[PDB]
Amino acid sequence: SMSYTWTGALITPCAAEESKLPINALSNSLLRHHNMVYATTSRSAGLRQKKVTFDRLQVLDDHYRDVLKEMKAKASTVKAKLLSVEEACKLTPPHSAKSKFGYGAKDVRNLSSKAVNHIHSVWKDLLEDTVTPIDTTIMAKNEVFCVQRKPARLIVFPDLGVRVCEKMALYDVVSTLPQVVMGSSYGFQYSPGQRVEFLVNTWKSKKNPMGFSYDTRCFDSTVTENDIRVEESIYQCCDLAPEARQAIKSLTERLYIGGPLTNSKGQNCGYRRCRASGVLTTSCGNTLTCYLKASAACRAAKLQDCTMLVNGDDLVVICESAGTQEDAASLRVFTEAMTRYSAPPGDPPQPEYDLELITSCSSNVSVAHDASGKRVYYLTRDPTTPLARAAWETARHTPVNSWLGNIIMYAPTLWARMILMTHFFSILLAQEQLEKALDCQIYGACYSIEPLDLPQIIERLHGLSAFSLHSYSPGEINRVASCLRKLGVPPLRVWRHRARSVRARLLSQGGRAATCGKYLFNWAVKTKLKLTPIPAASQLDLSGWFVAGYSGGDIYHS
Numbered sequence: 109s110m111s112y113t114w115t116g117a118l119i120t121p122c123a124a125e126e127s128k129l130p131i132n133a134l135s136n137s138l139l140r141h142h143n144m145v146y147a148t149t150s151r152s153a154g155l156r157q158k159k160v161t162f163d164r165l166q167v168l169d170d171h172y173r174d175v176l177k178e179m180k181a182k183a184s185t186v187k188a189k190l191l192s193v194e195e196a197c198k199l200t201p202p203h204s205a206k207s208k209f210g211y212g213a214k215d216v217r218n219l220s221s222k223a224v225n226h227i228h229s230v231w232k233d234l235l236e237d238t239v240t241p242i243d244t245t246i247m248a249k250n251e252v253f254c255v256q257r258k259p260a261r262l263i264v265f266p267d268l269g270v271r272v273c274e275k276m277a278l279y280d281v282v283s284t285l286p287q288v289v290m291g292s293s294y295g296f297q298y299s300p301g302q303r304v305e306f307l308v309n310t311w312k313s314k315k316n317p318m319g320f321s322y323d324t325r326c327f328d329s330t331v332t333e334n335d336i337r338v339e340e341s342i343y344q345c346c347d348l349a350p351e352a353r354q355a356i357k358s359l360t361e362r363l364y365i366g367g368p369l370t371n372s373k374g375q376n377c378g379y380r381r382c383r384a385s386g387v388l389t390t391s392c393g394n395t396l397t398c399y400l401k402a403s404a405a406c407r408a409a410k411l412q413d414c415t416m417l418v419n420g421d422d423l424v425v426i427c428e429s430a431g432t433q434e435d436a437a438s439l440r441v442f443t444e445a446m447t448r449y450s451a452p453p454g455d456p457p458q459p460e461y462d463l464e465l466i467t468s469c470s471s472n473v474s475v476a477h478d479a480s481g482k483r484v485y486y487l488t489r490d491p492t493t494p495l496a497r498a499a500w501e502t503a504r505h506t507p508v509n510s511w512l513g514n515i516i517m518y519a520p521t522l523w524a525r526m527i528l529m530t531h532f533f534s535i536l537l538a539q540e541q542l543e544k545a546l547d548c549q550i551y552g553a554c555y556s557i558e559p560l561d562l563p564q565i566i567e568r569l570h571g572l573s574a575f576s577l578h579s580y581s582p583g584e585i586n587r588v589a590s591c592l593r594k595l596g597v598p599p600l601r602v603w604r605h606r607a608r609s610v611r612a613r614l615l616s617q618g619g620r621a622a623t624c625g626k627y628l629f630n631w632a633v634k635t636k637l638k639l640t641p642i643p644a645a646s647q648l649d650l651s652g653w654f655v656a657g658y659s660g661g662d663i664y665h666s
C-alpha cells in the first residue's frame with residue numbers, strides 16, 4: 109500500500125510564514141552569518157510529499173512473531189486506567205489548536221460546558237462507531253535549521269475534541285506500557301544523565317563492544333497498517349476498562365491506521381495509510397514498532413548480545429564485536445532484515461568501536477572532570493541547531509523556547525554554559541523578565557518553567573557537578589569552536605568575558621537571581637565559590653519529566 113495518495117490540493121499555511129532569520133538589535137551579539145539560518149515553511153511541503161510517498165511491502169518471519177509474543181507477554185502485566193474528562197482536559201496545552209466545533213484550548217482547560225459537552229459526544233461516538241475514518245488536518249511545520257536546506261516536515265493531527273479523547277483512553281497506557289515491555293531499552297525513562305549511565309554501563313558490559321545507530325528513512329511513512337494493528341494488539345494485552353478497550357479499538361480503526369487529510373483551507377489533500385505524526389500514540393507506537401523490528405532483526409543478523417536503546421524512531425544498538433570484518437557483514441544482514449520489515453535505512457549503518465563516536469537522539473557521550481578532578485561522562489551534541497534556534501528566538505518570541513529546553517537537557521555542556529546561559533540571562537536581565545515563566549519541551553511534552561528555577565532544576569537532573577565540569581575533551585572543545593566559526597558566533601573567550609558581567613549583574617539582584625549568578629556562572633571566575641545543595645531543589649516536583657515520550661502528542665505538564 110502507498111503511504112499516501114494525494115488529490116493535488118496544496119498543503120496550505122495556517123498564517124504568515126517567515127523563512128529568513130528575523131534580525132533585531134540583539135542578533136549580532138550571538139550570530140553573524142544570518143544566511144546560514146532558516147525556517148521551513150509550507151512552500152517546501154510538495155518536496156516533502158515526494159520523499160514520504162512510497163509503497164510499503166512486508167515480509168514477516170518467525171523472529172518477528174517470536175519477539176512480538178514476548179512483547180505481548182510483558183504487556184499483559186500492565187494495568188492501565190481510563191482518564192476522566194477533567195484530567196485529560198488538564199493535560200491540554202494552553203495554546204493547543206482550537207476545535208472546529210466552536211471552542212479552544214482554554215475552553216477545555218477551564219472545563220467549559222461547550223467543550224466538555226462536545227468531548228462527551230466525541231467519546232460516545234468513538235464507542236458506537238468503530239469504522240468511520242476520522243478527519244485530520246495536515247500542516248507544514250515551521251522549524252529552524254542551519255544549512256546543509258531540508259523541506260518542511262508534515263504534521264497530521266485530529267480535532268481537539270478527539271485529542272482529549274485519545275488522552276482519556278490512552279494517556280496511562282502510553283505513559284506506562286513502553287517501559288514494562290522494553291525494560292531498560294526504553295529511552296524516554298532516562299534523564300540525560302541516566303541515558304549516559306545506561307550507555308556507559310551497557311558498553312562496559314561487553315567483552316569487545318561495538319555499536320551503531322540505525323537511521324530509518326522517513327520512519328512514520330514506513331509504518332504499515334499491519335504495524336499499527338500489531339501495536340493495538342499490544343495495547344489490548346493490558347488489563348483495561350471495557351470502555352478503554354472499545355475506544356482504543358475504535359481510535360485504531362478510525363484514526364491510527366489511516367484517514368483523510370484536510371488542509372488549513374478545508375480542502376481534501378488526500379489519504380494517509382501510515383503513522384500520523386500528530387497523535388497521542390505516535391511516540392509509543394514508533395518506539396514499540398522500532399524495538400520489535402530491530403530486536404527481530406538482531407536475531408536474523410545473529411548479532412551477539414545486542415542491547416537496544418530506542419526513543420521513537422531513534423535507534424541505537426550496542427553488542428559484542430565479532431571482529432571488524434564480521435561486524436560489517438552482520439550490520440548488512442541487520443539492515444536487510446529491517447528492510448524486509450519495512451524499516452529501510454536512510455544513512456547506511458556503520459559500526460563504531462568508540463562509544464563517544466556514536467550519535468543517538470542527536471547526542472553523544474563525552475567526558476569532562478568535576479571539582480575533585482574525576483572523569484565524568486555527560487551528554488552533549490553538535491550545537492549547530494541549538495544555536496540556529498537560539499538566534500531565531502533572540503529576535504522572535506516563539507511558542508517553544510528551545511534555548512531553555514536545551515539549557516535543561518544540556519546544562520553540563522561547554523556550549524550551553526558559556527553561550528546559551530550567558531546570552532539569554534543577559535537578555536532576561538535587560539528586559540527584567542527573569543521571573544516570567546516560559547514554555548519549553550522535554551521529550552515532546554510542554555512545560556512552563558521559570559528561568560529563576562534553572563539552578564535547582566539542574567541540580568535535580570544533573571547534580572551539583574553540572575556547575576563545575578571542566579577539561580572537556582579536545583574533540584568536544586573543537587567541535588564547538590568550529591561550530592562558532594561556521595555560524596559567525598563570537599569565540600568562547602568572548603562569552604567568558606560576557607559571563608563575568610552577566611554573573612555580576614545577577615548577583616546584584618540578590619535572591620533567586622543571585623543564586624543563578626552564583627551557580628550557573630561559577631565557571632566564569634578564576635576564584636570559584638562554594639556551591640552547596642540548594643534547599644529548594646528538593647521541593648520541585650520533577651515526577652513525570654523523564655517518564656515517557658509524547659512528541660506530537662499534545663501533552664502539557666503544568
Ligand SMILES: O=C(O)[C@H](Cc1ccccc1)N(Cc1cccc(C(F)(F)F)c1)C(=O)c1ccc(Cl)cc1Cl
Nearest residue numbers: 521522525526577578579580581585600601604631632
Ligand atoms: O576546561 C576547559 O575545557 C576550558 C577550555 C576552553 C578552550 C577554549 C575556549 C574556552 C574554553 N576552560 C579553559 C579556558 C578558560 C578561560 C579562557 C580560555 C581561553 F583563553 F583559552 F579562551 C580557556 C575553562 O576553564 C572552562 C571550563 C568550563 C566552562 Cl563552562 C567554561 C570554561 Cl572557559
